[PDB]
């Protein structure tokens, strides 16, 4: 009798969408955002060897980048990853957000680039960086397309 837990991270616990637009709301400057974004990360806890294996490699960014999920009962998904760059660390947050115990579907129902766009967290940035963005949601896609089959 007993329950193993792990991987406290907040993204939508209380990391929410909103609760980052709250954060952001008086930050108007991208500096800011792109500040405290580096500090998102700091926040996030460092990621263990252990669950770099339960994750994936992705060497597609700014720098390396590790990202876990998988589906539940129901479908709830839950993602847990990080990164080298503080940046890109933070930017998983709000990922992680977007993807609050999302459903594949869901997902492909509503990119998780949104909350990006609409904090403007990746709207501002460069169309280049963007591309790896992209990479990390089409992680998601290809993920949809094994659940969704």
């Given at each position: 009798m007993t329950n193993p837990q792990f991987a406290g991270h907040?993204?939508?616990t209380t990391v929410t969408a909103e609760t980052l637009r709250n954060t952001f709301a008086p930050l108007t400057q991208?500096?800011?955002?792109?500040?405290?974004?580096?500090?998102?990360?700091?926040?996030?806890?460092?990621l263990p060897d252990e669950l770099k294996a339960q994750a994936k490699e992705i060497a597609?960014?700014?720098?390396?980048?590790?990202?876990?999920?998988?589906?539940?009962?129901?479908g709830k998904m839950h993602f847990?990853?990080?990164?080298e760059?503080?940046?890109?660390?933070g930017l998983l947050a709000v990922l992680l957000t977007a993807v609050?115990?999302?459903?594949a579907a869901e997902?492909?129902?509503?990119?998780?680039?949104?909350?990006?766009?609409?904090?403007?967290?990746?709207?501002?940035?460069?169309?280049?960086?963007?591309?790896?963005?992209?990479?990390?949601?089409?992680?998601?896609?290809?993920?949809?397309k094994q659940v969704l089959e």
């Amino acid at each position: 009798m007993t329950n193993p837990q792990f991987a406290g991270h907040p993204f939508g616990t209380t990391v929410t969408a909103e609760t980052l637009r709250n954060t952001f709301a008086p930050l108007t400057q991208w500096e800011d955002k792109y500040r405290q974004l580096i500090m998102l990360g700091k926040q996030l806890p460092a990621l263990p060897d252990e669950l770099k294996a339960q994750a994936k490699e992705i060497a597609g960014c700014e720098n390396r980048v590790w990202l876990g999920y998988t589906v539940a009962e129901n479908g709830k998904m839950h993602f847990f990853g990080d990164s080298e760059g503080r940046i890109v660390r933070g930017l998983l947050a709000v990922l992680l957000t977007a993807v609050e115990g999302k459903t594949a579907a869901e997902l492909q129902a509503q990119s998780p680039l949104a909350l990006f766009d609409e904090l403007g967290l990746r709207a501002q940035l460069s169309a280049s960086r963007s591309q790896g963005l992209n990479a990390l949601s089409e992680a998601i896609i290809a993920a949809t397309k094994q659940v969704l089959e």
